Amino acid sequence: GEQDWEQYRDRVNMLQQERIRDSPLLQAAKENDLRLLKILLLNQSCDFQQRGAVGETALHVAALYDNLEAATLLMEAAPELAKEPALCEPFVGQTALHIAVMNQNLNLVRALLARGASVSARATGAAFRRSPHNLIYYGEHPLSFAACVGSEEIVRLLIEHGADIRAQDSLGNTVLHILILQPNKTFACQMYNLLLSYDEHSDHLQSLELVPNHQGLTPFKLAGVEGNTVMFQHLMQKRKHVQWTCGPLTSTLYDLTEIDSWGEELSFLELVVSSKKREARQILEQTPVKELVSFKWKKYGRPYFCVLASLYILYMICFTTCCIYRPLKLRDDNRTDPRDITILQQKLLQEAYVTHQDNIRLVGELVTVTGAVIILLLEIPDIFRVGASRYFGQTILGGPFHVIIITYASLVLLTMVMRLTNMNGEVVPLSFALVLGWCSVMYFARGFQMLGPFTIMIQKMIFGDLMRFCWLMAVVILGFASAFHITFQTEDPNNLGEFSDYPTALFSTFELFLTIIDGPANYSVDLPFMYCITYAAFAIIATLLMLNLFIAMMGDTHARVAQERDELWRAQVVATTVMLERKMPRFLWPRSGICGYEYGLGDRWFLRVENHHD
Amino acid sequence: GEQDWEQYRDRVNMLQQERIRDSPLLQAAKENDLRLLKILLLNQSCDFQQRGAVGETALHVAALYDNLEAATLLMEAAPELAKEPALCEPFVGQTALHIAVMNQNLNLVRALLARGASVSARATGAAFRRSPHNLIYYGEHPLSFAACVGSEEIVRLLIEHGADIRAQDSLGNTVLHILILQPNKTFACQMYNLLLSYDEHSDHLQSLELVPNHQGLTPFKLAGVEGNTVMFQHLMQKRKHVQWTCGPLTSTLYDLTEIDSWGEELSFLELVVSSKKREARQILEQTPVKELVSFKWKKYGRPYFCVLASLYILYMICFTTCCIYRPLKLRDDNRTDPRDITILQQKLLQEAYVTHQDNIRLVGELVTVTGAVIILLLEIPDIFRVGASRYFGQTILGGPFHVIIITYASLVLLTMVMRLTNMNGEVVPLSFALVLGWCSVMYFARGFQMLGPFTIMIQKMIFGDLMRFCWLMAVVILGFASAFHITFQTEDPNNLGEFSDYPTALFSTFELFLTIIDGPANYSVDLPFMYCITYAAFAIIATLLMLNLFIAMMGDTHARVAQERDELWRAQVVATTVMLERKMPRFLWPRSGICGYEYGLGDRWFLRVENHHD
Question: Are A138 and A178 spatial neighbours (Cβ–Cβ below 8 Å)?
Answer without folding.
Answer: yes
